[PDB]
Amino acid sequence: HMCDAFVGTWKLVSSENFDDYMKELGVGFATRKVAGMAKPNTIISVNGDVITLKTESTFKNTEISFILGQEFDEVTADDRKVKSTITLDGGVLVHVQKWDGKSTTLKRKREDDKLVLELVMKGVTCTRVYERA
Numbered sequence: 001h002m003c004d005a006f007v008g009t010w011k012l013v014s015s016e017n018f019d020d021y022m023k024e025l026g027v028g029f030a031t032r033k034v035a036g037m038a039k040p041n042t043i044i045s046v047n048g049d050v051i052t053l054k055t056e057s058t059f060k061n062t063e064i065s066f067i068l069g070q071e072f073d074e075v076t077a078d079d080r081k082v083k084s085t086i087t088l089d090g091g092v093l094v095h096v097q098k099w100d101g102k103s104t105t106l107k108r109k110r111e112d113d114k115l116v117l118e119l120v121m122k123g124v125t126c127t128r129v130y131e132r133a
């Protein structure tokens, strides 16, 4: 029952500082424009110990499957080749990506009826709020 509160289909409702976050990742002008326009859905499912997280939009579709604590190689929506580990820390799903001496964190928490995604790179924090579809 590790991740029960996260399971389902979620839709983006608000975004704060995403452009700045994408700049910190090195995302170029055209991609930042088209990515910022996106209204994704995030679909989280669980089969035993395997969690699947899909992110679907008109810009890109991504899909990762993982076991908590077990590192995996990920190719992100902006085409970074990263080493990823996802853990549950006190009810928060913490996703760390490492590449090229750099790191970013993607943390997901349940707050009221929302799924709140915090993206942090260096000094920059973006918050993406999702609600159930």
Ligand SMILES: CCCCCCCCCCCCCCCC(=O)O
Pocket: 022, 027, 031, 035, 036, 038, 040, 042, 055, 056, 057, 059, 060, 061, 076, 077, 078, 117, 128
């Ligand atoms: C997948 C639709 C959003 C578009 C992102 C594509 C270009 C930038 C990718 C940025 C890093 C991944 C950000 C996660 C954002 C989110 O799940 O809401």
